Amino acid sequence: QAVVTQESALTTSPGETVTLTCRSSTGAVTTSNYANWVQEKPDHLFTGLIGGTNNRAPGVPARFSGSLIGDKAALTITGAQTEDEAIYFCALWYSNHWVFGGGTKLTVLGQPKSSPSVTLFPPSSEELETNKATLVCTITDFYPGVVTVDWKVDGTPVTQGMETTQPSKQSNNKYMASSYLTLTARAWERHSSYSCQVTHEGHTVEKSLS
Amino acid sequence: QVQLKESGPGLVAPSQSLSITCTVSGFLLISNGVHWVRQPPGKGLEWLGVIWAGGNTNYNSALMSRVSISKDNSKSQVFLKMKSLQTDDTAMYYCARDFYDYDVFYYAMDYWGQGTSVTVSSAKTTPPSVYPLAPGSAAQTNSMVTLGCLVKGYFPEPVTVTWNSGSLSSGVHTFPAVLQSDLYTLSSSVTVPSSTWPSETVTCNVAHPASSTKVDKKIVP
Structure with missing residues (x-):
């Protein structure tokens, strides 16, 4: 009461x-x-x-x-x-x-809309020694603060192993977020193309690697 | 000018005690009261108590028994002691000034401190592993190259990431941290002119205060 x-x-x-x-x-x-x-x-x-x-x-x-x-x-x-x-x-x-x-x-x-900037980083050789492989997808300068990131391993959409942060406000009032795909070193070596696809207000921004 | 700054322990274990300090400046405690307010993660604000200028205190009845507020006039410090912690005591803890000397009488919380985050957990402090984030795709995208450091498996937050000991202030992004099975992981990125790297070295410096650990990772192609 x-x-x-x-x-x-x-x-x-x-x-x-x-x-x-x-x-x-x-x-x-x-x-x-x-x-x-x-x-x-x-x-x-x-x-x-x-x-x-x-x-x-x-x-x-x-x-x-x-x-x-x-x-x-x-x-x-x-x-x-x-x-x-x-x-x-x-x-x-x-x-x-x-x-x-x-x-x-x-x-x-x-509010003024802004489309995300995406960067995709490969697992480091240092990390592979540990038998884990993390792909890092950074997303900055977007507005409003809600994205959808999808990951694909060899053209096939991934279902498990990804973690996405909750968007944070940057000094400039735009948002930021990060998405992580964790594989085992083995899996990393078994596949070839990796893609980070970020969906912001209807548009899609994808980045890939080999 | 009127300022309030909280300082607390960061990590505390369930069933133990919590002590936080509110250091004020720009006003005297002999003349102004101070309130303690908390905000649990993804929750609204919750009032804890107030200590008036004269020393009387009032507490949120729900907490009444576990909370105690006190001050040091000469020291410009207000303290909050909270016992019998449960993990639901995890929150941002704030101090705010009490004011009522208006044209018509009314009480108001006029100036707020910035808050201090307290994590109530039985999880163990664990230093981070630092990995460099290099482009891979070493094809010139434009004039700039963006590099990073992956800070993995640490507890509790926070970690501090600096580039070349603070020199590089140039489009540095420290992303929010993800928590998986009580271990946080975060990344930090820096953008530099492509003519520069690898000619000129880029190093990320990570500090984990809770484990008194410092690690530096040179990012190479």
Whole structure:
């Protein structure tokens, strides 16, 4: 009890108005709960936006406002921008403790798309001594942050042995990821062509070796 | 200026204890309270507690028994002690400043620290094996050649990868780490003018703090 809930995902496009809500399991949200709205930006960058229900912190853009909409606290973004794309957390004060909500994932469409750069690396001779062989497929400078990589050994799609990382944000706001195909030294020597195929927003980028 | 920096142990074993420090700067603890918040992997934020300027503390009731917060005014340090760990205590731990001196009274967490990652596991520290990533396809793609280092089988994170002792800052990419059966594996790549390599040597320097290990691998064709 004293469970704070928020929508889990919302999507908007630039210039539109979006309202995020925050509910207390315990009853109506009041002024005394001092609703705080915190913004999470890629790679744990937390920024306080609104405090005490409707007080915008000094450095925050005027497009952010907070209010009590009926029985709940609300965060309204009037004329949403691509950089508003973040996770928004709500927190409510209950006289002796704070309770955070689950957070709302806000997606702003109209972001600028970028196609991945792919590099395929062969297993090293040093690694083969160990009787294992790892092929490394690096993927950088893509946007949005979701790819699909498929691997093929001798034209045949591989089903097992691959591991793909979860995309990470680069300094430049584009994403990166890595895919690994682990074989035994034996398998490595039994086949000839190796291909890393990365699928980003409908397009495919494949790289191969021998 | 207002800053908060957390420092903690990195790896801790289930059923043991956790101690983390929040070092503050730009404000005094005799005047401002500090909160402790955690974020479990792929989870939202969870409040742990607060220590007010006057020394009173309040705890999330769920944790109440296992947590304890304290401070050192003169030292600008706040501490969080957490006991009876389970692996679900794995999280990013943050300190944030408490503020209420507004036009109308309200409590707010105004400035957040950057966090410290704590891994709660009974897994063993294991130094990495470093392998060079060379093109294979030695055909001139353009003016640049991209090389790398594969950092395999280490625990716990993190590892530090540098190229020629930091000299090469030139389009260096350190990819996120994959975890397979409690051993992490990561790669790092560097892009250099093709006229250069192999004429001029390229070395990757890997440091594994948890095992106090340093390895250097020269990347040759």
